[PDB]
Every structure is written in C-alpha cells, then in structure tokens.
Amino acid sequence: EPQVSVVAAPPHPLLGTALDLVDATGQSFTQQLTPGQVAGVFGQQLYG
Amino acid sequence: EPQVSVVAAPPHPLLGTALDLVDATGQSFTQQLTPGQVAGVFGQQLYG
Structure with a gap:
C-alpha cells in the first residue's frame, strides 16, 4: 500500500x-441501503 | 434465499x-476495471 x-x-x-x-448539466448522487442498514437509518416508526 | x-x-x-x-434523456453505463482485470481485457501489447 502507498504510505x-x-x-x-x-x-x-x-x-x-x-x-x-x-x-x-448538474451533479447527481445515488445510494443503496441494505435490509441491515435500513432499520439503523429509519429511526422512527409509525404504527410499527 | 428466494427462489x-x-x-x-x-x-x-x-x-x-x-x-x-x-x-x-438516453441511457448511460459505467465500468471499473481493477488491475488484474485490465491485463485480461487488454489482450494486445504495443511495444510492451
């Protein structure tokens, strides 16, 4: 590896x-969330 | 697993x-080639 x-x-x-x-013409971005990540990011529940 | x-x-x-x-307005595509793949696809050498 480089130092x-x-x-x-x-x-x-x-x-x-x-x-x-x-x-x-202007910048764009993308993400995939796995089933493991989604429950970590979606920190609110409505009706379960 | 699913089916x-x-x-x-x-x-x-x-x-x-x-x-x-x-x-x-019309589809686009991308690829990353890592060094071991590059030597597999670039099957011609000019002057080494």
Whole structure:
C-alpha cells in the first residue's frame, strides 16, 4: 500500500456516491441501503 | 434465499452496469476495471 493517504471521509448515508457522468448539466448522487442498514437509518416508526 | 429464478447473465465486461439516473434523456453505463482485470481485457501489447 502507498504510505500517502487522504482522510477518506464516508459519504452522508442518504446521498452516497456522487456520479461524474460526463455530459451532465448538474451533479447527481445515488445510494443503496441494505435490509441491515435500513432499520439503523429509519429511526422512527409509525404504527410499527 | 428466494427462489433461484432471480439469476441473470453477467454484464459485457467493458460496457458494465446500466445506470438509471431518473431524468436522463438516453441511457448511460459505467465500468471499473481493477488491475488484474485490465491485463485480461487488454489482450494486445504495443511495444510492451
């Protein structure tokens, strides 16, 4: 591994990775949440 | 597991994954090739 490294902070968990799609007029981002993650992020319940 | 009927063919190796950016006017795709894959796909050498 290189001895040099950046701080590599994690993405804000609702927007995820930014796309660098070439001809884009404005930036866009995507995330997948697994069944394990969803119950950790969706911290409120309505009627269960 | 769900019923195994879910499975489908792999992506064409350098065309990769089709995106679904919502308001896109025509489809786009991306691939990452890691170094061991690069030597597998780039089957010609010029001057080494």
